[PDB]
Amino acid sequence: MVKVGYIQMEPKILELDKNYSKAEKLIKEASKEGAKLVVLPELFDTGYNFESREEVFDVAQQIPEGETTTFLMELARELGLYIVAGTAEKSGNYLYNSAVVVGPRGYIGKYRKIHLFYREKVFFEPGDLGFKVFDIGFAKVGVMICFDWFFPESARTLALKGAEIIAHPANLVMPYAPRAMPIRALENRVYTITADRVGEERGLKFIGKSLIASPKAEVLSIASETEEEIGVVEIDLNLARNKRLNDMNDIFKDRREEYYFR
């Protein structure tokens, strides 16, 4: 078994340093509780509700040499844990709504949000790296961001590629995700870690309710709607690796692709 957790925090729009300080305080708390993998919210460094593409472009960092990835690499190296975090990615003249994965030995990789939500389409380019699974030694972690939860194909693709844990940075505004995550975890027999932010930001109100769901649709930990907090729980990677729902049904062996999407 291994302990993993979400970091439910409240980013202050455009205040990178303050957001790094807050992430560090909470990640250190999770580390003390024994977490070996922690997940931060979507765009935890920049905040979300931009009024123009220019205000986010002016603060967004490059991956992996920019400040956000460098800062997270330091925490992972010094605390001895893995981190998945949402961050605004600057790449040349372009911006992506991204997530970085870092561990004790350095940068591991990144994911770019495939399904953009609402006004994100005004600022960010749609993701173009596909749904990737990363090796964090003791497990394989898939990453998807926020609205990607809405399309069952996002988690499905990560799980079929071997993800045992789906790390899910989010800034939720609709009411549905908390009810859907246990089903995403169940249908793929994986653990999901949805790290949502809280707070009001220029008219948008995030719902909090970060949660960790098990392969049996169990809500192992669920956060408040408005408070910053961590949620760390022990998970059983063998419950996610063994896809046998019962002795006659292995969920992945039972798939019949020739009848899907056509």
Interface contacts to its own copies, rule CB under 8 A? 114-115, 117-119, 121, 126-127, 130-131, 147, 150-153, 156-157, 160-161, 176, 179-180, 182-183, 186-187, 217, 245-249, 251, 254-257, 259-262
Of the candidates 225, 174, 202, the one whose C-alpha atom is nearest the C-alpha of residue 49 is 202
Cβ(86)–Cβ(145) below 8 Å: yes
- Preceding omega of 41 cis (within 30 degrees of 0): no
To the query of whether residue 113 is one of the catalytic residues in this protein, the response is: yes
Cβ(50)–Cβ(19) below 8 Å: no
Q: Which is nearer to its own copies, 92 or 118 (CB)?
A: 118
Q: How far is the CB of 173 from its own copies (least distance, A)?
A: 10
Q: Which is nearer to its own copies, 61 or 157 (CB)?
A: 157
Q: Which of 140, 146, 164, 209 is catalytic?
A: 146
Q: What's the CA gap between 87 and 61, in Å, rounded? A: 8
Backbone angles phi, psi at 26, to 5 degrees: -70, -35
Q: Which of 10, 22, 42, 140 is catalytic?
A: 42
Q: How far is the CB of 12 from its own copies (least distance, A)?
A: 25
Backbone angles phi, psi at 210, to 5 degrees: -55, 150
Q: Which is nearer to its own copies, 169 or 182 (CB)?
A: 182
Pairing assessment for the beta strands 140-143 and 165-170 based on DSSP bridges: parallel
Q: How far is the CB of 133 from its own copies (least distance, A)?
A: 11
The residues carrying an active-site annotation are 42, 113, 146
